[PDB]
Write a protein that binds this DNA or RNA. Structure first.
Ligand SMILES: [K+]
Ligand SMILES: [K+]
Ligand SMILES: [K+]
Ligand SMILES: [Mg+2]
Ligand SMILES: [Mg+2]
Ligand SMILES: [Mg+2]
Ligand SMILES: [Mg+2]
Ligand SMILES: [Mg+2]
Ligand SMILES: [Mg+2]
Ligand SMILES: [Mg+2]
Ligand SMILES: [Mg+2]
Ligand SMILES: [Mg+2]
Ligand SMILES: [Mg+2]
Ligand SMILES: [Mg+2]
Ligand SMILES: [Mg+2]
Ligand SMILES: [Mg+2]
Ligand SMILES: [Mg+2]
Ligand SMILES: [Mg+2]
Ligand SMILES: [Mg+2]
Ligand SMILES: [Mg+2]
Ligand SMILES: [Mg+2]
Ligand SMILES: [Mg+2]
Ligand SMILES: [Mg+2]
Lengths: 88, 49, 101, 565, 132, 171, 312, 196
RNA sequence: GACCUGGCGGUGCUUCAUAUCCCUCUAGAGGAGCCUGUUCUGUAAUCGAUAAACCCCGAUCAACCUCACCACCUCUUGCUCAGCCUAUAUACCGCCAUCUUCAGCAAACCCUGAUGAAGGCUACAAAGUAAGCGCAAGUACCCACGUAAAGACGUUAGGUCAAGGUGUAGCCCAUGAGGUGGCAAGAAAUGGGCUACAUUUUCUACCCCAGAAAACUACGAUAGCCCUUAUGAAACUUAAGGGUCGAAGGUGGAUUUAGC
RNA sequence: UUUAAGAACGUGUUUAUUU
């Protein structure tokens, strides 16, 4: 599609927690679990509203099972009219 | 809402669309206790009075 | 068709606490301040204490939604340690595995 | 993407055990899946409370229970309107009397909405999940009762009543009701005039010359009341004229030319009613040929939109014309028009789809080269339609014409995969072709490996009602294909089945049995050939026996042979 | 001794499947997960509701396809969709499978307010990994 | 609730108590043993108490060339199906209770003199259909082990013969 | 059991499936090696299972199915080998050949190489072997070498020897770089516990060290920490000859010094002789210290300590 | 007799076919459709991995058969008609901040489930350097005292983060409004300012 | 009477134990105060664990709720096509403890013992071949190390019917359901832990080049008492902080825990 | 050849095509 893209791998996060092994007593004996969350950031640059609307829809639909996404959009704006000159 | 889950699957079993292996189990036991005489008594007219 | 009566009593408590949540909120605001007169704050102390007991949120208990167990419950899944492990040990909880390090 | 030739329609489960093999399964598999959707909707609308909880965001209205019961239990003008939107014929009419009996003023826009509900369904309840011949309209019905109760009647009152009569084959009564309309200084609409054209012809079975004059009167009245015709108005004319195949031919074109005059684009249904009319069971078909060629040039390179309910029936008919004309260059235009844009959606239901691809493919095998006929057989089947026993036959008669009999062992495999494993006519034409002439060893050994599979089908048959029967030609061909191949051992075991089922063996099967015995030099086997034919009293046997006696025969056996006759 | 999700050894006449033959300490080494969603990821939400839906689905399908399931289900979530993938036997007639596919896909769509699709893979007999 | 319901294999495994501490060292009387019963044996898919007829599942899809519609059996006709299901149940059950009169040997509960049939056929096309096997002694012998303790083992003595001078015994 | 006909049908499915997989990915079926198959199977069927023997695999049937011995007797029933009834015709036919070559010698008269291991000898013979059987065969081979073996014998003995890749415990020198001014220096990295340090050692200097932009004696008040910084340079007699500029992050007081000590030593290896670098290695100045904090266990007070035990 | 299953359609497939037509969209692994002798599973002693037929491990995988390179290149060729060209003028980032001095950040979250809502989507961040604004000595000195820790002197950037209102369009308006009242009050001079 | 197998021996010889048996190292427990559990006693007033393998154990947790206890009162087809935390863990599933800081269990065959219970090895080899499970191998964490995890068959009718389910037995105007209020204390003994008895210390600054303190105003309570705040509808009661107070205690008996 | 070193309630643990 003619888009600039850079890829880097942020550090993973591992959340652990422990639970009792038995239904009754036997405190000393426990079981530990973990959920591993792995990341992958795709930094695009110099897009337009329409190009991003297409690329995002294309990859969001083909987002596999067990994979979430956080899309941060950095828009370019111009100074409002009221900001150009002071009224006082 | 356990009412919905339990009422839905109770209706689906009477309709013939869901087979509850657990009710069938306790329905067979409750049928063998009638032949053995261990039947639930009538309310109010119980052993005590 | 809930697990037990202990569960059923908590369902009612969570329902009555959802109806009076706003009424209790508005009255407590009067009590939690040093601005309004003491005479007015004393009347709000009696109005919120005359509301039904089950409307108080501290009387709610986070039980397991499958077994009605009051203790040993994980808040993220709303399950007891015994039911959570039964599903995790059979590979039915996405991403959950045993830890080794 | 494009259609996957190796697959069946998406709607089916992509699994070998669940894939529809035959065309009956294809239709019975979707009717069972549609029956489960109805069993679930029945349960969803009978116990709404279980499915009321909505957790979706954004809200999905199409996934919530429907409420078919009236909620306003009071008797008022707004309580009847709610029973007309739910199409409650019995409740609305029984409640309309109560509202009328009370004396409350009923608006004319509300009483007109009740007639539409009654004039359409004919004072009968719509079809629900769970609770042809003759004239549906009845004299003892509420439609006519309420019509008299009304104190005031506008144009719409009669317009909706005339259309309800024609719909239920009350043509004779509709015309009588139209006379009253003209007596009240009123004017009908386009739709009412459209139904009036159907009643004219259907009322009486008169000659065309009289009907044509009758129809022209309604048209002159349509222009005399400032009423403009629509596409449907012209379609009814053509649909009605179908009965008079020969005479209506020229009048039909005049109707078509008229449609073009008023700038009304003929839809697919318009052209459908024309080809059916011109088409007639005749041998020459000179006129039919010229018509279709002109229509295609007009339709070529166009995209169609739904205008008439019968637009779908165009393609099925056009193909039938090409098949009757045996013109393949025209079928490529009819089918090439079905692929442009989204015109593939007009092909119609399954039964119409199977018929289209049968006449089409049956005309391909007959006319075009075999190398191209096999590319159409890989694309259409099974992705498009499931073939019928006849199509397999016509395809077999094309391989013969092209001397490509090496594919026969493959056409039999596909036949079993399409449900033709136990088709008598099919198995009786595959064997004859393989055994018609001698072929090289490599090709002669393949036909036997296929003749052994055709033989097993005769042994195991699904229908056990009647005793297993082996056609005479079959047994004649299964045995001769073992000899030529080299399976002599199995060739002698079929001999008992000939007399067992009283099936006559051909002389060519007996004449070739000689070499098999001669190569073996086992006089015993040679006598068995003689013994069999003697039972049937075949003349060739007696003359044959002498030659066998000259070539190879034991002295003791020679004497016994003559006495057995 | 440990007991969770372990099939005890026997004389050698007991057949087991791949998933049924591996214990919990293989769930990310030699097995995968039978359900795949985003609830249990860092910063995600609604992991408790996704679990109750899973528990109900495995029971709805066990009693709706009685004696037909060859192995455990595989639930998949891609956005709004919910894909149920099952391995079933070939005893039942295909006519009855198509009925239950349309009955379950529809009933579950109105219950959970999501498009639901069911994918069957028939096997002649229950696959056997080894004999314990 | 619906979430506190297990499967049949879990319900029977616990009720039978086949694997327990009582079963290991003769701590349980065999006079009243609990017997497993399959409750899905005589159940049809689509049959319920209300008597609904689902086309494609409970009844044929098409009838007289036309697809059927949803129908429900009548009270009188549905009651005849419940009573008929019982007869099939009791009959099936009765067969199991019925005990065959096995030919006793030297005594009713003894094993001696009882026949075991012909030996099993050998792999290399060997058969012993002409031979007859008969038990002579069945003894229960024990040996003490360090972990379990008393380890019960069976000692059997049999004889085989063809009736024509060929005979032999083994343990 | 897997017959020869079965394997022959698996060879045909792999060849056909190898042409499909190349049509999917858009490659040339001809020049499609096994390395490209493994890369395409990991994209189409992504599995993150820690065990690589449990991931999807599409290999050649000759590498998946275990090698099996051919049939040893024909239709008549006579075996093909004269040592068949031993049960180890392959192992004993080898011992018979070797012992026959030791008789001929009597009549007419290692660094990289390692003796074949047991598990690798079973594959060659397609026979199951005991440990004591492996030792007996190895004793004959060694006895064969001692004797004046002929050329043909050496080739035989080399079928049961496997080369060894001898690693080199020689430190890797860093490339000397040049700055804008033209001064030569070398950069390295160290790691101690959670501390991580990057050190820049200039070829010529007046013995100045700056840690995070601060002179070393101010950054490390404790004498012990400064002793560590002195150890690399004192060992090679280069005190007051180089200028160091390092940046350490993380860890604690003493872990940052050890991390810097290691980086300075690694970067100081470019301005010294090879013999000195070896001495630094034998003194423990170039080795990363693997001793890191051990984890606490459940049911215990610490990594190794236990709760107080009560007998009664 | 019993109904028998048809042979898998992988045999009818050709090698030089169009795979995207077979797996156009995301779908589970169908061994009767994928013409690969792929195996999966941990092998037993002297055994081989389990075959694809009946394998549950291959059904657990989120495959990428519908996203082969051939399809991707063919999909994007049809998606170039929806795209727009980026201004050639705005080559670097220094030139982007000269004509567009304001940067709006907003995050969208994609998660499985029936509800798409997320409260983290309402947040809006607005960054702008004070060198791009028409400020004088006094205004700039006063503006830095009102925003407090929202201004970074090291970068000379004013950061405004709004998460008060439910919707994201409202917080965008709120942020612009905040930048406006700050700019004008900064210019305004009051009497108390004299007592500095 | 004579044997088989196992167990046991204050039974022999030999080789060993690696934080483990002795000797040998380091810090603790047992003494004081406090926190906390348990046992007894007490109360109208839960239950369960309770040699090793119970004792900050079910509880990653009790002011009401939780809660199953006591008193009083109230309801009867009852949130449930009812219900019961009623009895039975010596009927069970399920999840575990323990030997295990082990390496053996064993189907199917063969042979020996005159065809007995049983047994089955010697490598310069004498009847053993062995699927499978476990160990091992692999995998996780920072490796090849180490730590985790794993750890069969069985042993203690070991623990749990009060996670849930459940066989058998029992209650059905009550052994069920709901409401209000209330008990959860200490003569006494004991387990574990916290803080101290000080100068390698105490306070302040700093976060390692300092100044003061240092025995009846020292060191030393997280205790008591009083006040305030936080949470909550509700706090002498729970927590935090402040004030006041300045106790025992001067390194601890027989004995005893952990650590490469 | 080499200090002393007691005691442990009673039962219960194995078969059968539109038209
Ligand atoms: K002490
Ligand atoms: K103490
Ligand atoms: K203590
Ligand atoms: Mg609480
Ligand atoms: Mg353990
Ligand atoms: Mg008797
Ligand atoms: Mg410590
Ligand atoms: Mg207690
Ligand atoms: Mg007790
Ligand atoms: Mg107990
Ligand atoms: Mg309480
Ligand atoms: Mg209370
Ligand atoms: Mg009770
Ligand atoms: Mg027990
Ligand atoms: Mg461990
Ligand atoms: Mg291991
Ligand atoms: Mg006990
Ligand atoms: Mg403790
Ligand atoms: Mg104090
Ligand atoms: Mg307060
Ligand atoms: Mg003091
Ligand atoms: Mg005594
Ligand atoms: Mg005793």
């Amino acid at each position: 599609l003619g888009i600039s893209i850079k890829v880097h791998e942020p550090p993973r996060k591992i959340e652990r927690f422990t639970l009792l092994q038995s239904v009754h007593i036997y405190k000393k004996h426990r079981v530990q679990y973990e959920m591993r969350t792995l990341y992958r950031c795709l930094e695009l640059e110099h897009l337009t509203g329409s190009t991003a609307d297409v690329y995002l829809e294309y990859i969001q639909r083909n987002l596999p099972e067990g994979v979430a996404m956080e899309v941060t959009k950095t828009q370019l704006e111009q100074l409002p009219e009221h900001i150009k000159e002071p009224i006082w | 809402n356990h009412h919905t889950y339990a009422e839905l699957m109770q209706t689906l079993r009477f309709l013939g669309l869901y087979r509850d292996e657990h009710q069938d189990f306790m329905d067979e036991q409750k049928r063998l206790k009638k032949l053995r005489g261990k039947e639930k008594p009538k309310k109010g007219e119980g052993k005590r009075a | 068709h809930y697990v037990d009566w202990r569960m059923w009593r908590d369902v009612k408590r969570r329902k009555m606490a959802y109806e009076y949540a706003d009424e209790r909120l508005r009255i407590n605001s009067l009590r939690k301040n040093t601005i309004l007169p003491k005479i007015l704050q004393d009347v709000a102390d009696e109005e919120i204490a005359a509301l039904p007991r089950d409307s108080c949120p501290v009387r709610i208990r986070n039980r397991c939604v499958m077994t009605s167990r009051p203790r040993g419950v994980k808040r993220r899944w709303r399950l007891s340690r015994i039911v959570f492990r039964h599903l995790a040990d059979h590979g039915q909880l996405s991403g959950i595995q045993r830890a080794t390090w | 993407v494009n259609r996957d030739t190796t697959a069946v329609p998406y709607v089916f489960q992509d699994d070998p055990y669940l894939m529809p093999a035959s065309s009956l399964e294809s239709r019975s598999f979707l009717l069972a899946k549609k029956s489960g959707e109805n069993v679930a909707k029945f349960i969803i609308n009978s116990y709404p409370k279980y499915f009321q909880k909505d957790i979706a965001e954004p809200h999905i209205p199409c996934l919530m229970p429907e409420y078919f019961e009236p909620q306003i239990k009071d008797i008022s003008e707004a309580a009847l309107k709610e029973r007309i939107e739910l199409r409650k014929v019995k409740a609305s009419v029984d409640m309309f009397d109560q509202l009328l009996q009370a004396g409350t003023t009923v608006s004319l826009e509300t009483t007109n909405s009740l007639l539409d509900l009654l004039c359409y369904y004919g004072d009968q309840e719509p079809s629900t999940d769970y609770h042809q011949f003759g004239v549906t309209w009845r004299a003892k019905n509420n439609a006519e009762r309420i019509f008299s109760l009304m104190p005031e009647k506008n144009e719409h009152s009669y317009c909706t009543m005339i259309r309800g009569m024609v719909k239920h084959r009350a043509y004779e009564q509709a015309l009588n009701l139209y006379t009253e309309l003209l007596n009240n200084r009123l004017h009908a609409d386009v739709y009412t005039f459209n139904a009036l054209i159907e009643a004219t012809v259907c009322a009486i079975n008169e000659k065309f010359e009289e009907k044509w004059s009758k129809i022209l009167e309604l048209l002159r009245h349509m222009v005399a009341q400032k009423v403009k015709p629509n596409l449907q108005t012209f379609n009814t004319i053509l649909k009605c004229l179908r009965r008079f195949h020969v005479f209506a031919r020229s009048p039909a074109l005049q109707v078509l030319r008229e449609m073009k005059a008023i700038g009304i684009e003929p839809s697919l249904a318009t052209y459908h009613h024309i080809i059916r009319l011109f088409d007639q069971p005749g041998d020459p078909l000179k006129r039919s040929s010229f018509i279709i060629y002109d229509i295609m040039n007009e339709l070529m390179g166009k995209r169609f939109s739904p205008k008439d309910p019968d637009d779908d029936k165009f393609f099925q008919s056009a193909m039938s014309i090409c098949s009757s004309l045996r013109d393949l260059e025209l079928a490529y235009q009819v089918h090439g028009l079905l692929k442009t844009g989204d015109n593939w959606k007009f092909i119609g239901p399954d039964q119409h789809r199977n018929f289209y691809y049968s006449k089409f493919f049956d005309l391909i095998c007959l006319m075009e080269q075999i190398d191209v006929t096999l590319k159409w057989y890989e694309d259409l089947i099974p992705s498009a339609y499931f073939p019928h026993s006849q199509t397999m036959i016509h395809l077999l008669q094309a391989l013969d014409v092209a001397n490509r009999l090496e594919v026969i062992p493959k056409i039999w495999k596909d036949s079993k995969e399409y449900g033709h494993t136990f088709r008598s006519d099919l198995r009786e034409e595959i064997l004859m072709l393989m055994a018609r002439d001698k072929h090289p060893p490599e090709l002669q050994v393949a036909f036997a490996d296929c003749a052994a599979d055709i033989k097993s089908a005769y042994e195991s048959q699904p229908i056990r009602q009647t005793a297993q029967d082996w056609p005479a030609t079959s047994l004649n061909c299964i045995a001769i294909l073992f000899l030529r191949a080299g399976r002599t051992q199995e060739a002698w075991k079929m001999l008992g089945l000939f007399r067992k089922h009283n099936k006559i063996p051909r002389s060519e099967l007996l004449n070739e049995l000689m070499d098999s015995a001669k190569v073996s030099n086992s006089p015993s086997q040679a006598i068995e050939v003689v013994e069999l034919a003697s039972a049937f009293s075949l003349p060739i046997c007696e003359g044959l026996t002498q030659r066998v006696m000259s070539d190879f025969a034991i002295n003791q056996e020679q004497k016994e042979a003559l006495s057995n006759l | 001794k440990n007991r969770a999700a372990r099939v005890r050894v026997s004389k050698g006449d007991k057949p087991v499947t791949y998933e049924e033959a591996h214990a919990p300490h293989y769930i990310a080494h030699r097995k995968g997960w039978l359900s795949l969603h985003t609830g249990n990821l860092d910063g995600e939400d609604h992991a408790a509701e996704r679990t109750v839906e899973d528990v109900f689905l495995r029971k709805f399908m066990w009693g709706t396809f009685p004696g037909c399931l060859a192995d455990q289900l595989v639930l998949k979530r891609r956005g709004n969709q919910l894909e149920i993938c099952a391995v079933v036997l070939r005893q039942l007639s295909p006519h009855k499978y198509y009925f239950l596919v349309g009955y379950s896909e529809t009933l579950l769509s109105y219950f959970y307010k999501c498009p639901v699709r069911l994918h069957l893979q028939t096997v002649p007999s229950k696959v056997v990994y080894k004999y314990l | 609730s619906f979430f506190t319901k297990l499967t049949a294999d879990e319900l029977w495994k616990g009720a039978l108590a086949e694997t327990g501490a009582g079963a290991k060292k003769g701590r349980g009387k065999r006079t009243k043993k609990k017997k497993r019963k399959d409750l899905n044996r005589g159940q049809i898919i689509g049959e319920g108490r209300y008597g609904f007829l689902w086309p494609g599942l409970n009844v044929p899809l098409m009838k007289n060339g036309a697809v059927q519609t949803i129908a429900q059996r009548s009270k009188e006709e549905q009651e005849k199906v419940e009573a008929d299901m019982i007869q099939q149940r009791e009959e099936w059950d009765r067969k199991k209770k019925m005990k065959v009169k096995r030919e006793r040997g030297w005594s009713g509960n003894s094993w001696g003199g009882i026949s075991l049939g012909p030996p099993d056929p050998g792999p290399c096309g060997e058969t012993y259909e002409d031979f007859d096997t008969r038990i002579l002694e069945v003894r229960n012998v024990f040996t003490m082990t360090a972990k379990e303790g008393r380890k019960k083992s069976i000692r059997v003595l049999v004889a085989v013969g063809n009736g024509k001078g060929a005979a032999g015994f083994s343990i | 059991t897997y017959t020869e006909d079965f394997i022959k049908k698996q060879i045909e499915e792999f060849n056909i499936g190898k042409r499909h997989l190349a049509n999917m990915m858009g490659e040339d079926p001809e020049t499609f090696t096994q390395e490209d198959i493994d890369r395409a199977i990991a994209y189409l069927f992504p599995s993150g299972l820690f065990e690589k023997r449990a991931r999807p695999v599409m290999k050649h049937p000759e590498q998946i199915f275990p090698r099996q011995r051919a049939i040893q007797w024909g239709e008549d029933g006579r075996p093909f080998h004269y040592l068949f009834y031993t049960g180890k015709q392959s192992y004993y036919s080898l011992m018979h050949d070797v012992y026959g070559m030791l008789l001929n010698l009597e009549k007419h008269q290692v660094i990289g190489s390692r003796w074949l291991i047991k598990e690798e000898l079973e594959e060659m013979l397609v026979e199951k072997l005991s440990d004591l059987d492996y030792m007996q065969f190895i004793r004959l081979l060694e006895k064969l070498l001692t004797s004046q073996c002929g050329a043909a014998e050496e080739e035989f003995v080399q079928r049961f020897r496997r080369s060894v890749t001898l690693e080199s415990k020689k430190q890797l020198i860093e490339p000397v770089q040049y700055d804008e001014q033209g001064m030569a220096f070398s950069k390295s990295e160290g790691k101690r516990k959670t501390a991580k340090a990057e050190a820049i050692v200039y070829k010529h200097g007046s013995g100045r060290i700056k840690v995070n932009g601060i002179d070393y004696q101010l950054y490390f008040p404790i004498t012990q920490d400064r002793e560590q910084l002195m150890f690399p340079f004192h060992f090679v007699d280069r005190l007051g000859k180089h200028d160091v500029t390092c940046t350490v992050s993380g860890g604690g007081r003493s872990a940052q010094a050890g991390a810097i000590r290691l980086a300075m030593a690694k970067a100081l290896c470019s301005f010294v002789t090879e013999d000195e670098v070896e001495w630094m290695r034998q003194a423990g100045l170039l080795t990363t210290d693997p001793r890191v904090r051990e984890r606490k266990k459940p049911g215990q007070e610490g990594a190794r300590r236990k709760f107080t035990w009560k007998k009664r | 007799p019993r109904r028998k299953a048809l042979p898998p359609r992988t045999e009818k497939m050709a090698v030089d076919q169009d795979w995207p037509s077979v797996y156009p969209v995301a779908a589970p692994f169908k061994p009767s459709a994928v013409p690969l002798p792929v195996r999966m599973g941990y092998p037993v002693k002297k055994g081989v991995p389990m075959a694809k037929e009946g394998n549950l491990e291959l059904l657990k995988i989120p495959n990428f058969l519908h996203l082969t390179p051939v399809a991707i290149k063919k999909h994007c060729e049809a998606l170039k008609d929806f795209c727009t060209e980026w201004p050639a003028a705005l080559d670097s980032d220094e030139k982007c901040e000269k004509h567009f001095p304001i940067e709006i950040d907003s995050t969208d979250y994609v998660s499985s489930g029936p509800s798409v809502r997320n409260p983290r989507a309402r947040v809006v961040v607005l960054r702008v350097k004070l060198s791009s604004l028409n400020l004088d000595d006094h205004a700039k000195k006063k503006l830095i005292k009102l925003v407090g820790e929202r201004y970074c002197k090291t970068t000379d950037v004013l950061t405004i983060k709004t998460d008060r209102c439910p919707l994201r369009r409202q917080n965008y308006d709120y942020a612009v409004y905040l930048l406006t009242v700050l700019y004008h009050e900064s210019w305004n001079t009051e009497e108390w300012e004299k007592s500095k």
